[PDB]
Amino acid sequence: GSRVKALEEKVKALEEKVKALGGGGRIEELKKKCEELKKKIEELGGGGEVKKVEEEVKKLEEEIKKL
Ligand SMILES: *Sc1ccc(O)cc1
Numbered sequence: 321g322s323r324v325k326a327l328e329e330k331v332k333a334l335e336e337k338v339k340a341l342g343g344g345g346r347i348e349e350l351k352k353k354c355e356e357l358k359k360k361i362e363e364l365g366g367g368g369e370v371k372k373v374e375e376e377v378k379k380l381e382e383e384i385k386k387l
Contacts, residue, residue, distance in 0.1 A: 326374035327361045330381045334358065337384045347387065353380050 334354050341347060357377055360368060 323370040323374055327370060327377065330374075330377045331358055331361060333384055334377070334380055337387070341387045343387065350380070350383060350387070 334357055338347065338351055338354055357373070357380060360373055364370075364373070
């Protein structure tokens with residue numbers, strides 16, 4: 321399937337979008353989940369599971385569609 325393909329891509333839309341969206345309130349917590357998402361993948365290599373990151377991020381990415 322992908323697993324990582326979903327992690328490598330989302331990381332681009334995750335930050336780039338928020339960095340270009342510039343907002344507050346809803347964006348305040350939105351970034352909190354972002355900084356943690358980028359640090360997990362870039363750092364994780366053997367542990368943490370790749371399927372666990374693509375599933376969780378699914379919530380963040382979907383949130384970008386609105387913002
Ligand atoms: S990951 C990320 C990047 C930029 C923001 O403004 C927020 C989250």
